[PDB]
Amino acid sequence: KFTRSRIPDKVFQPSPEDHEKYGGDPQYPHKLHIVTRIKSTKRRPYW
Amino acid sequence: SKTILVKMMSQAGTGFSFNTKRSRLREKLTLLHYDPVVKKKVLFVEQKKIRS
Amino acid sequence: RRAAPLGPMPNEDIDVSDLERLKKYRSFDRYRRRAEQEARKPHWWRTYREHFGEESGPKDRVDIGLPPPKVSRTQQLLERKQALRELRANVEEERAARLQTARIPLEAVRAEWERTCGPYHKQRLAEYCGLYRDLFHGATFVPRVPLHVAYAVGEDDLMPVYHGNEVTPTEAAQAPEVTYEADEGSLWTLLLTNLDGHLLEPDAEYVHWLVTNIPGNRVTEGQETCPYLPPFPARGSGFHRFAFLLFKQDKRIDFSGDTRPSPCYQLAQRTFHTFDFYKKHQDAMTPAGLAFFQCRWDDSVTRVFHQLLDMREPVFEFVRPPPYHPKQKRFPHRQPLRYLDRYRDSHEPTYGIY
Amino acid sequence: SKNLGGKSPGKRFGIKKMEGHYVHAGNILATQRHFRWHPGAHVGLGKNKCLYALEEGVVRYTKEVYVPNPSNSEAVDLVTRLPQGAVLYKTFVHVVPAKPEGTFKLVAML
Amino acid sequence: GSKAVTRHRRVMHFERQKLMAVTEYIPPKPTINPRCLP
Amino acid sequence: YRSKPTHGIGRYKHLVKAQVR
Amino acid sequence: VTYFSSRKGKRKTVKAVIYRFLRLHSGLWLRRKAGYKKKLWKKTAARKRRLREFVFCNKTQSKLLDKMTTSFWKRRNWYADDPYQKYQDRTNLKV
Amino acid sequence: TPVKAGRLIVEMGGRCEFKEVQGFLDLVAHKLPFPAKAVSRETLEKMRKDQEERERNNQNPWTFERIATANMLGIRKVLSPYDLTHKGRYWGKFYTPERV
RNA sequence: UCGGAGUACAAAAAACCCUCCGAGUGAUUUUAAUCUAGACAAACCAGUCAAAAUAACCAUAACAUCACUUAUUGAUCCAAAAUUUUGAUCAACGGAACAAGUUACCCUAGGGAUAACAGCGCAAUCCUGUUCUAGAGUUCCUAUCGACAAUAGGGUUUACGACCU
RNA sequence: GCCUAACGAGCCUGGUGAUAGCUGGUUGUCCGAGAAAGAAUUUUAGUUCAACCUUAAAAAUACCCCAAAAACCCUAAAUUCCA
Ligand SMILES: Nc1nc2c(ncn2[C@@H]2O[C@H](COP(=O)(O)O)[C@@H](O)[C@H]2O)c(=O)[nH]1
Ligand SMILES: [Mg+2]
Ligand SMILES: [Mg+2]
Ligand SMILES: [Mg+2]
Ligand SMILES: [Mg+2]
Ligand SMILES: [Mg+2]
Ligand SMILES: [Mg+2]
Ligand SMILES: [Mg+2]
Ligand SMILES: [Mg+2]
Ligand SMILES: [Mg+2]
Ligand SMILES: [Mg+2]
Ligand SMILES: [Mg+2]
Ligand SMILES: [Mg+2]
Ligand SMILES: [Mg+2]
Ligand SMILES: [Mg+2]
Ligand SMILES: [Mg+2]
Ligand SMILES: [Mg+2]
Ligand SMILES: [Mg+2]
Ligand SMILES: [Mg+2]
Ligand SMILES: [Mg+2]
Ligand SMILES: [Mg+2]
Ligand SMILES: [Mg+2]
Ligand SMILES: [Mg+2]
Ligand SMILES: [Mg+2]
Ligand SMILES: [Mg+2]
Ligand SMILES: [Mg+2]
Ligand SMILES: [Mg+2]
Ligand SMILES: [Mg+2]
Ligand SMILES: [Mg+2]
């Protein structure tokens, strides 16, 4: 059965090199997201 | 072994008939039931035989 | 998916292997004792004690009371031991214990109870009945001194008032007597208050009696602050609680703001806050005595309402909430014919245009 | 063939109301085949082992101890065979009351 | 429709084949060969 | 329930068994 | 159902509707539970009461009965000593 | 009898070396249905720690564990729920030790 | 036709000419009432529980029990009872009140929704190759074979599928 | 077998516009939203319902949903219900 996928919390623990790689601030998180859809919702589940 | 269905009639004078399964090889049955028209504990006897 | 427990399992302490070597209880009473011991521990999972009103659970009780009496433990133990040995020394005690015929002097048992553990028992009755909650909130006291209230019905009839008792206002129409043991070196304050029965304010209480600066035992010789008033509950709402409080005060304190006049039938004047009143004079008074009784409505309440306070007597009623009904459907499916009677307004045939 | 009568629909036994759901008196909280959830406070028991709310309020699910009826011989025998450190734990369904029992209203002043 | 475990190697979906191909093992390759190093 | 930390709180059959050289 | 009769050209009704159904003026249809006269000795008292109870009809059944019923039976009726006269009208319906 | 990957079938002991034992056990292991090897304790630990050093000396940042557990590019629509445990090294009854 | 377990591993649901147990009732007395909130479940018909309120009895006395308890059962109409009840291997078990064979003398409406022929999918069966030496061959695995096993390929036979007609 | 070129029972007329769950056909333009199966059934070539969907009309909460919660020997991906 294909169902929804649980995502473990270990994935979103950032390494100290990730801030240097992606230009993020290790102290202050940013305030607002720019979100832009790339792919299509076709061939993807209804949720 | 088979059972018989017997109709029981009230001894309180009021007409009330209720059916009871009873074993065939046993004797005539006499029970203590409740009559909803007399609201008392009424002795009932086996009167007729209906169903095998 | 499996998660980790937050703390110990209940049965993980005992060993699964070698079941024959582990001792068993063979008594259902032993299980009853063990289970009632186990149910009182604060487990980390959701419990009945968490959900069904344990009244904040652990509470830091502020104690506003007299010091406990300092009694020498070793001397007390040895005199109790010697009294017990002289009690088992007798043979007639063995005879009365064996032949199922022995009586105890319950009056002497009551006296030693009043001296020994009566304070702690009256404290737990006051905690159960919520005397501390509606007078001093989280604060509590041990009723150290013995205290006796009695109402004189006639020549010989004398109706006592103990902790949590039930006295009809016909007995309590007149002023009571108060008995307690004290030497002439201290000052006392007696205050009878009705905790529930205030009409306008739910958080306030009535004064029914108040006498201050009592020299020793003698209540009558003390200065009279507020007059005695007979108990007046409502006809509908019964069982109002009336509490006698006794405070020990060091200095002689006079009140100019708490003084009440001679007839004083105005319930606007008879409005009390025992919390704020003890806040006013915390440094002088310490509560030592307490005795409270329940009181319901009788025919003698009517004269107190009409003749004394000039009242039309209010009558209340215990009204339950109306029964729940769902939202009415246009087409009910598999429902009795009486389903319309649940939502019918009145049992009267109404004709709109006919 | 050799195996017959394997066709039978489900009896829909299961849990109906969760923790936090508001129920009234008479609502069936759960139905069960064997004793899976036991009735607790303000939860009745029908003869088909269904659990129904006795008072109007909020449903809770709780773990407590099992002290069975002494007239139940198999249960008290299971109690007798337990070792001394062991206590039985089961789950229970409760309804905390929301509405009070009643109120006092002034109907007539005389 | 075939079973989950067969004997005919169970030829894969193309996205899973791309997954296998991108996640093949690659060895560490040093900058200078240690044999003809000193 | 399986996923809860309170799983197996009702386990009793491992404590009572009911089924020489 | 004869939608157009051969004698009068009107819409007939089915008497099997009338012989076991009752129509209230709110559109609700009343009926008996099935099997209330069959095998009373075998069934429990609660089941006997449940079969002795009157029941209502839902939307699809009520519309089927209204379609198979002519307009004579949908009239307003004022019988003397009618037990269903109290049940004819609907009240407190917030839809 | 069902046999999974990594299950020992016949275990031999004695006072002699591995070489002749491997020499006559390769003929046994060849004729089995699944692929099989004649292994010793040292050889088994050698290939196990070889698998570990290959896994920790992965050069590419992208691996089956990181993709499948975090659900990268919606790969769980194609992958099996068993593949979270199998980590791509097992597909059906076939196990490839070069997979990492 | 109905029930129990797995299939269907954790709320429910969930099929097969899938794998296994059963049911078409016995035993006993505790002979098990009336009314009515609110619910489960369900296309409909059916099925299940049920607090409060009356009456019976300790004078504030409503679960019939056991056999895995779950299944132990049948709708209208119609017949007999007569004051309130009953009647079906209607077992094809949502049930036509009562009806069999054969047609190569056959007919019509259709179907590749469905078989025989061929084609196609698969290679159980069939046919080819190789891996392995226990053993035959007076010694001697491989001159000629080669048991127990492995692996790959072909689409000649009989199937299996029912995809084009 | 033969009974006026078709005989398991002639031909013509009438009933007759016989009835077909079966096959075929169904005639102008443009726009809006738009459906793949749970239950019974002499029933699986069809019907009658439920779930979906269309046109209007009332309302107010709808999906996503952190905790907390949902069984007893062992049990994965995960489900229910909720701010
Ligand atoms: N016994 C019985 N017969 C019924 C029932 N309903 C219809 N019948 C029909 O009534 C007739 C009884 O006559 P019999 O065949 O017994 O002489 C039969 O045609 C039977 O099919 C019923 O409920 N019970
Ligand atoms: Mg001591
Ligand atoms: Mg089943
Ligand atoms: Mg089924
Ligand atoms: Mg498939
Ligand atoms: Mg091999
Ligand atoms: Mg529902
Ligand atoms: Mg009751
Ligand atoms: Mg049939
Ligand atoms: Mg049928
Ligand atoms: Mg059915
Ligand atoms: Mg012939
Ligand atoms: Mg033809
Ligand atoms: Mg075909
Ligand atoms: Mg088809
Ligand atoms: Mg086709
Ligand atoms: Mg041909
Ligand atoms: Mg063919
Ligand atoms: Mg062809
Ligand atoms: Mg084939
Ligand atoms: Mg091939
Ligand atoms: Mg030889
Ligand atoms: Mg001719
Ligand atoms: Mg036609
Ligand atoms: Mg058809
Ligand atoms: Mg469009
Ligand atoms: Mg429809
Ligand atoms: Mg959650
Ligand atoms: Mg919500």
mmCIF file of all heavy atoms in Angstrom, chain I residues 7 11 14 22 42 46 54 57 107 123 137 151 164:
data_model
loop_
_atom_site.group_PDB
_atom_site.id
_atom_site.type_symbol
_atom_site.label_atom_id
_atom_site.label_comp_id
_atom_site.label_asym_id
_atom_site.label_seq_id
_atom_site.Cartn_x
_atom_site.Cartn_y
_atom_site.Cartn_z
ATOM 1 P P U I 7 -3.833 -11.403 8.438
ATOM 2 O OP1 U I 7 -2.452 -10.861 8.444
ATOM 3 O OP2 U I 7 -4.942 -10.644 9.068
ATOM 4 O "O5'" U I 7 -4.219 -11.705 6.922
ATOM 5 C "C5'" U I 7 -3.244 -12.180 6.007
ATOM 6 C "C4'" U I 7 -3.867 -12.642 4.713
ATOM 7 O "O4'" U I 7 -4.983 -13.522 4.992
ATOM 8 C "C3'" U I 7 -4.467 -11.559 3.830
ATOM 9 O "O3'" U I 7 -3.493 -10.879 3.059
ATOM 10 C "C2'" U I 7 -5.479 -12.333 2.991
ATOM 11 O "O2'" U I 7 -4.835 -12.987 1.909
ATOM 12 C "C1'" U I 7 -5.959 -13.398 3.981
ATOM 13 N N1 U I 7 -7.269 -13.071 4.597
ATOM 14 C C2 U I 7 -8.386 -13.597 3.978
ATOM 15 O O2 U I 7 -8.321 -14.291 2.979
ATOM 16 N N3 U I 7 -9.584 -13.290 4.569
ATOM 17 C C4 U I 7 -9.777 -12.521 5.696
ATOM 18 O O4 U I 7 -10.922 -12.330 6.106
ATOM 19 C C5 U I 7 -8.578 -12.011 6.282
ATOM 20 C C6 U I 7 -7.396 -12.301 5.730
ATOM 21 P P A I 11 -6.162 -0.921 16.168
ATOM 22 O OP1 A I 11 -6.323 0.066 17.263
ATOM 23 O OP2 A I 11 -6.331 -2.365 16.457
ATOM 24 O "O5'" A I 11 -7.178 -0.532 15.008
ATOM 25 C "C5'" A I 11 -7.331 0.817 14.596
ATOM 26 C "C4'" A I 11 -8.779 1.229 14.611
ATOM 27 O "O4'" A I 11 -8.905 2.618 14.216
ATOM 28 C "C3'" A I 11 -9.691 0.493 13.645
ATOM 29 O "O3'" A I 11 -10.087 -0.782 14.118
ATOM 30 C "C2'" A I 11 -10.846 1.468 13.482
ATOM 31 O "O2'" A I 11 -11.718 1.404 14.601
ATOM 32 C "C1'" A I 11 -10.117 2.807 13.517
ATOM 33 N N9 A I 11 -9.814 3.310 12.166
ATOM 34 C C8 A I 11 -8.587 3.403 11.564
ATOM 35 N N7 A I 11 -8.635 3.898 10.352
ATOM 36 C C5 A I 11 -9.981 4.143 10.144
ATOM 37 C C6 A I 11 -10.691 4.682 9.057
ATOM 38 N N6 A I 11 -10.112 5.068 7.918
ATOM 39 N N1 A I 11 -12.033 4.798 9.171
ATOM 40 C C2 A I 11 -12.622 4.409 10.309
ATOM 41 N N3 A I 11 -12.056 3.898 11.400
ATOM 42 C C4 A I 11 -10.723 3.792 11.254
ATOM 43 P P A I 14 -16.505 -6.041 5.108
ATOM 44 O OP1 A I 14 -17.833 -6.679 4.936
ATOM 45 O OP2 A I 14 -15.674 -6.383 6.289
ATOM 46 O "O5'" A I 14 -15.637 -6.338 3.810
ATOM 47 C "C5'" A I 14 -15.977 -5.766 2.554
ATOM 48 C "C4'" A I 14 -14.789 -5.769 1.631
ATOM 49 O "O4'" A I 14 -13.869 -4.724 2.029
ATOM 50 C "C3'" A I 14 -13.955 -7.039 1.653
ATOM 51 O "O3'" A I 14 -14.479 -8.044 0.803
ATOM 52 C "C2'" A I 14 -12.574 -6.552 1.236
ATOM 53 O "O2'" A I 14 -12.489 -6.436 -0.176
ATOM 54 C "C1'" A I 14 -12.539 -5.147 1.837
ATOM 55 N N9 A I 14 -11.843 -5.097 3.135
ATOM 56 C C8 A I 14 -12.394 -5.178 4.389
ATOM 57 N N7 A I 14 -11.518 -5.091 5.358
ATOM 58 C C5 A I 14 -10.310 -4.938 4.696
ATOM 59 C C6 A I 14 -8.988 -4.792 5.150
ATOM 60 N N6 A I 14 -8.649 -4.772 6.440
ATOM 61 N N1 A I 14 -8.012 -4.660 4.226
ATOM 62 C C2 A I 14 -8.341 -4.677 2.928
ATOM 63 N N3 A I 14 -9.547 -4.810 2.380
ATOM 64 C C4 A I 14 -10.494 -4.938 3.326
ATOM 65 P P G I 22 -15.419 -29.010 13.753
ATOM 66 O OP1 G I 22 -16.149 -29.366 14.996
ATOM 67 O OP2 G I 22 -14.625 -30.048 13.050
ATOM 68 O "O5'" G I 22 -16.459 -28.404 12.710
ATOM 69 C "C5'" G I 22 -17.842 -28.326 13.017
ATOM 70 C "C4'" G I 22 -18.184 -27.036 13.717
ATOM 71 O "O4'" G I 22 -17.614 -25.912 12.994
ATOM 72 C "C3'" G I 22 -19.663 -26.704 13.805
ATOM 73 O "O3'" G I 22 -20.330 -27.383 14.852
ATOM 74 C "C2'" G I 22 -19.651 -25.194 13.964
ATOM 75 O "O2'" G I 22 -19.298 -24.833 15.291
ATOM 76 C "C1'" G I 22 -18.498 -24.812 13.040
ATOM 77 N N9 G I 22 -18.952 -24.538 11.664
ATOM 78 C C8 G I 22 -18.507 -25.209 10.551
ATOM 79 N N7 G I 22 -19.046 -24.791 9.442
ATOM 80 C C5 G I 22 -19.901 -23.776 9.841
ATOM 81 C C6 G I 22 -20.755 -22.957 9.064
ATOM 82 O O6 G I 22 -20.924 -22.967 7.841
ATOM 83 N N1 G I 22 -21.454 -22.051 9.850
ATOM 84 C C2 G I 22 -21.347 -21.946 11.211
ATOM 85 N N2 G I 22 -22.099 -21.012 11.806
ATOM 86 N N3 G I 22 -20.552 -22.702 11.945
ATOM 87 C C4 G I 22 -19.858 -23.597 11.208
ATOM 88 P P A I 42 -21.824 0.802 8.349
ATOM 89 O OP1 A I 42 -20.609 0.276 7.679
ATOM 90 O OP2 A I 42 -21.904 2.240 8.705
ATOM 91 O "O5'" A I 42 -23.077 0.452 7.433
ATOM 92 C "C5'" A I 42 -23.505 -0.889 7.252
ATOM 93 C "C4'" A I 42 -24.969 -0.941 6.905
ATOM 94 O "O4'" A I 42 -25.738 -0.405 8.011
ATOM 95 C "C3'" A I 42 -25.382 -0.093 5.713
ATOM 96 O "O3'" A I 42 -25.181 -0.749 4.476
ATOM 97 C "C2'" A I 42 -26.840 0.226 6.011
ATOM 98 O "O2'" A I 42 -27.670 -0.876 5.677
ATOM 99 C "C1'" A I 42 -26.815 0.365 7.532
ATOM 100 N N9 A I 42 -26.625 1.761 7.977
ATOM 101 C C8 A I 42 -25.449 2.465 8.102
ATOM 102 N N7 A I 42 -25.595 3.692 8.531
ATOM 103 C C5 A I 42 -26.963 3.809 8.712
ATOM 104 C C6 A I 42 -27.772 4.869 9.155
ATOM 105 N N6 A I 42 -27.294 6.063 9.511
ATOM 106 N N1 A I 42 -29.107 4.663 9.221
ATOM 107 C C2 A I 42 -29.595 3.467 8.866
ATOM 108 N N3 A I 42 -28.933 2.395 8.435
ATOM 109 C C4 A I 42 -27.610 2.632 8.377
ATOM 110 P P A I 46 -38.259 -3.062 8.656
ATOM 111 O OP1 A I 46 -39.661 -2.643 8.890
ATOM 112 O OP2 A I 46 -37.163 -2.074 8.804
ATOM 113 O "O5'" A I 46 -37.924 -4.285 9.612
ATOM 114 C "C5'" A I 46 -36.647 -4.395 10.217
ATOM 115 C "C4'" A I 46 -35.826 -5.487 9.584
ATOM 116 O "O4'" A I 46 -34.855 -4.903 8.680
ATOM 117 C "C3'" A I 46 -34.991 -6.311 10.545
ATOM 118 O "O3'" A I 46 -35.739 -7.337 11.169
ATOM 119 C "C2'" A I 46 -33.862 -6.822 9.662
ATOM 120 O "O2'" A I 46 -34.294 -7.930 8.889
ATOM 121 C "C1'" A I 46 -33.650 -5.634 8.724
ATOM 122 N N9 A I 46 -32.587 -4.717 9.183
ATOM 123 C C8 A I 46 -32.755 -3.386 9.466
ATOM 124 N N7 A I 46 -31.662 -2.775 9.844
ATOM 125 C C5 A I 46 -30.704 -3.773 9.799
ATOM 126 C C6 A I 46 -29.329 -3.769 10.085
ATOM 127 N N6 A I 46 -28.666 -2.684 10.490
ATOM 128 N N1 A I 46 -28.647 -4.928 9.944
ATOM 129 C C2 A I 46 -29.306 -6.020 9.539
ATOM 130 N N3 A I 46 -30.595 -6.144 9.238
ATOM 131 C C4 A I 46 -31.251 -4.976 9.388
ATOM 132 P P U I 54 -41.213 6.845 39.334
ATOM 133 O OP1 U I 54 -41.538 7.589 40.576
ATOM 134 O OP2 U I 54 -40.221 5.741 39.377
ATOM 135 O "O5'" U I 54 -42.568 6.271 38.728
ATOM 136 C "C5'" U I 54 -43.290 5.260 39.407
ATOM 137 C "C4'" U I 54 -44.245 4.547 38.488
ATOM 138 O "O4'" U I 54 -43.658 4.416 37.166
ATOM 139 C "C3'" U I 54 -44.584 3.122 38.890
ATOM 140 O "O3'" U I 54 -45.597 3.058 39.877
ATOM 141 C "C2'" U I 54 -44.979 2.484 37.569
ATOM 142 O "O2'" U I 54 -46.307 2.840 37.217
ATOM 143 C "C1'" U I 54 -44.020 3.175 36.596
ATOM 144 N N1 U I 54 -42.771 2.417 36.303
ATOM 145 C C2 U I 54 -42.728 1.117 35.782
ATOM 146 O O2 U I 54 -43.682 0.388 35.552
ATOM 147 N N3 U I 54 -41.462 0.621 35.564
ATOM 148 C C4 U I 54 -40.255 1.256 35.758
ATOM 149 O O4 U I 54 -39.196 0.680 35.501
ATOM 150 C C5 U I 54 -40.373 2.583 36.264
ATOM 151 C C6 U I 54 -41.586 3.095 36.493
ATOM 152 P P C I 57 -45.172 -7.657 45.451
ATOM 153 O OP1 C I 57 -46.656 -7.621 45.516
ATOM 154 O OP2 C I 57 -44.390 -6.433 45.761
ATOM 155 O "O5'" C I 57 -44.661 -8.827 46.403
ATOM 156 C "C5'" C I 57 -43.430 -8.711 47.098
ATOM 157 C "C4'" C I 57 -42.325 -9.484 46.420
ATOM 158 O "O4'" C I 57 -42.160 -9.015 45.058
ATOM 159 C "C3'" C I 57 -40.946 -9.325 47.037
ATOM 160 O "O3'" C I 57 -40.753 -10.172 48.153
ATOM 161 C "C2'" C I 57 -40.007 -9.621 45.875
ATOM 162 O "O2'" C I 57 -39.845 -11.022 45.703
ATOM 163 C "C1'" C I 57 -40.799 -9.076 44.684
ATOM 164 N N1 C I 57 -40.358 -7.727 44.245
ATOM 165 C C2 C I 57 -39.274 -7.616 43.367
ATOM 166 O O2 C I 57 -38.690 -8.642 42.986
ATOM 167 N N3 C I 57 -38.879 -6.389 42.952
ATOM 168 C C4 C I 57 -39.520 -5.298 43.370
ATOM 169 N N4 C I 57 -39.094 -4.110 42.936
ATOM 170 C C5 C I 57 -40.633 -5.378 44.253
ATOM 171 C C6 C I 57 -41.010 -6.595 44.661
ATOM 172 P P C I 107 -30.913 -24.154 -37.724
ATOM 173 O OP1 C I 107 -30.394 -23.827 -39.075
ATOM 174 O OP2 C I 107 -29.979 -24.212 -36.574
ATOM 175 O "O5'" C I 107 -32.061 -23.108 -37.368
ATOM 176 C "C5'" C I 107 -33.140 -22.872 -38.261
ATOM 177 C "C4'" C I 107 -34.122 -21.882 -37.689
ATOM 178 O "O4'" C I 107 -34.688 -22.395 -36.453
ATOM 179 C "C3'" C I 107 -33.548 -20.535 -37.290
ATOM 180 O "O3'" C I 107 -33.356 -19.663 -38.386
ATOM 181 C "C2'" C I 107 -34.567 -20.029 -36.283
ATOM 182 O "O2'" C I 107 -35.712 -19.515 -36.946
ATOM 183 C "C1'" C I 107 -34.967 -21.324 -35.574
ATOM 184 N N1 C I 107 -34.242 -21.534 -34.294
ATOM 185 C C2 C I 107 -34.630 -20.819 -33.148
ATOM 186 O O2 C I 107 -35.580 -20.025 -33.216
ATOM 187 N N3 C I 107 -33.981 -21.024 -31.978
ATOM 188 C C4 C I 107 -32.972 -21.892 -31.914
ATOM 189 N N4 C I 107 -32.356 -22.058 -30.740
ATOM 190 C C5 C I 107 -32.551 -22.631 -33.055
ATOM 191 C C6 C I 107 -33.208 -22.426 -34.204
ATOM 192 P P A I 123 9.204 -17.536 -19.752
ATOM 193 O OP1 A I 123 10.193 -17.093 -18.737
ATOM 194 O OP2 A I 123 9.366 -17.125 -21.168
ATOM 195 O "O5'" A I 123 9.124 -19.125 -19.701
ATOM 196 C "C5'" A I 123 8.870 -19.816 -18.480
ATOM 197 C "C4'" A I 123 8.371 -21.223 -18.720
ATOM 198 O "O4'" A I 123 7.460 -21.219 -19.851
ATOM 199 C "C3'" A I 123 9.449 -22.254 -19.050
ATOM 200 O "O3'" A I 123 9.038 -23.534 -18.564
ATOM 201 C "C2'" A I 123 9.441 -22.262 -20.577
ATOM 202 O "O2'" A I 123 9.939 -23.446 -21.162
ATOM 203 C "C1'" A I 123 7.957 -22.059 -20.877
ATOM 204 N N9 A I 123 7.680 -21.393 -22.151
ATOM 205 C C8 A I 123 8.067 -20.130 -22.526
ATOM 206 N N7 A I 123 7.657 -19.779 -23.718
ATOM 207 C C5 A I 123 6.934 -20.879 -24.152
ATOM 208 C C6 A I 123 6.235 -21.144 -25.342
ATOM 209 N N6 A I 123 6.150 -20.280 -26.355
ATOM 210 N N1 A I 123 5.620 -22.342 -25.461
ATOM 211 C C2 A I 123 5.702 -23.215 -24.449
ATOM 212 N N3 A I 123 6.329 -23.078 -23.282
ATOM 213 C C4 A I 123 6.929 -21.878 -23.195
ATOM 214 P P G I 137 32.922 -51.287 -14.062
ATOM 215 O OP1 G I 137 32.626 -52.737 -14.171
ATOM 216 O OP2 G I 137 33.755 -50.797 -12.937
ATOM 217 O "O5'" G I 137 33.620 -50.836 -15.417
ATOM 218 C "C5'" G I 137 33.071 -51.208 -16.671
ATOM 219 C "C4'" G I 137 33.676 -50.405 -17.789
ATOM 220 O "O4'" G I 137 33.372 -48.996 -17.609
ATOM 221 C "C3'" G I 137 35.192 -50.438 -17.886
ATOM 222 O "O3'" G I 137 35.688 -51.626 -18.481
ATOM 223 C "C2'" G I 137 35.487 -49.167 -18.669
ATOM 224 O "O2'" G I 137 35.191 -49.346 -20.046
ATOM 225 C "C1'" G I 137 34.450 -48.210 -18.075
ATOM 226 N N9 G I 137 35.015 -47.458 -16.938
ATOM 227 C C8 G I 137 34.925 -47.768 -15.603
ATOM 228 N N7 G I 137 35.553 -46.921 -14.835
ATOM 229 C C5 G I 137 36.094 -45.999 -15.715
ATOM 230 C C6 G I 137 36.880 -44.848 -15.464
ATOM 231 O O6 G I 137 37.261 -44.407 -14.375
ATOM 232 N N1 G I 137 37.219 -44.188 -16.641
ATOM 233 C C2 G I 137 36.850 -44.590 -17.901
ATOM 234 N N2 G I 137 37.274 -43.825 -18.918
ATOM 235 N N3 G I 137 36.117 -45.663 -18.147
ATOM 236 C C4 G I 137 35.777 -46.317 -17.017
ATOM 237 P P U I 151 20.066 -21.803 -10.182
ATOM 238 O OP1 U I 151 19.860 -20.581 -9.365
ATOM 239 O OP2 U I 151 18.925 -22.710 -10.456
ATOM 240 O "O5'" U I 151 20.688 -21.360 -11.579
ATOM 241 C "C5'" U I 151 21.811 -20.492 -11.637
ATOM 242 C "C4'" U I 151 22.415 -20.473 -13.019
ATOM 243 O "O4'" U I 151 22.839 -21.814 -13.381
ATOM 244 C "C3'" U I 151 21.477 -20.072 -14.145
ATOM 245 O "O3'" U I 151 21.298 -18.674 -14.262
ATOM 246 C "C2'" U I 151 22.126 -20.715 -15.361
ATOM 247 O "O2'" U I 151 23.234 -19.944 -15.802
ATOM 248 C "C1'" U I 151 22.655 -22.020 -14.766
ATOM 249 N N1 U I 151 21.724 -23.158 -14.972
ATOM 250 C C2 U I 151 21.781 -23.806 -16.189
ATOM 251 O O2 U I 151 22.554 -23.486 -17.074
ATOM 252 N N3 U I 151 20.908 -24.855 -16.340
ATOM 253 C C4 U I 151 19.995 -25.316 -15.419
ATOM 254 O O4 U I 151 19.273 -26.273 -15.703
ATOM 255 C C5 U I 151 19.988 -24.599 -14.183
ATOM 256 C C6 U I 151 20.831 -23.579 -14.009
ATOM 257 P P C I 164 -9.995 -8.995 -27.741
ATOM 258 O OP1 C I 164 -11.013 -7.918 -27.760
ATOM 259 O OP2 C I 164 -10.411 -10.385 -27.428
ATOM 260 O "O5'" C I 164 -9.263 -9.024 -29.154
ATOM 261 C "C5'" C I 164 -8.551 -7.892 -29.631
ATOM 262 C "C4'" C I 164 -8.200 -8.039 -31.088
ATOM 263 O "O4'" C I 164 -7.157 -9.036 -31.235
ATOM 264 C "C3'" C I 164 -9.327 -8.538 -31.975
ATOM 265 O "O3'" C I 164 -10.190 -7.494 -32.386
ATOM 266 C "C2'" C I 164 -8.590 -9.211 -33.126
ATOM 267 O "O2'" C I 164 -8.160 -8.248 -34.075
ATOM 268 C "C1'" C I 164 -7.355 -9.776 -32.419
ATOM 269 N N1 C I 164 -7.483 -11.210 -32.061
ATOM 270 C C2 C I 164 -7.274 -12.201 -33.029
ATOM 271 O O2 C I 164 -7.001 -11.881 -34.195
ATOM 272 N N3 C I 164 -7.380 -13.500 -32.671
ATOM 273 C C4 C I 164 -7.672 -13.830 -31.414
ATOM 274 N N4 C I 164 -7.767 -15.121 -31.103
ATOM 275 C C5 C I 164 -7.880 -12.854 -30.407
ATOM 276 C C6 C I 164 -7.769 -11.576 -30.774
#
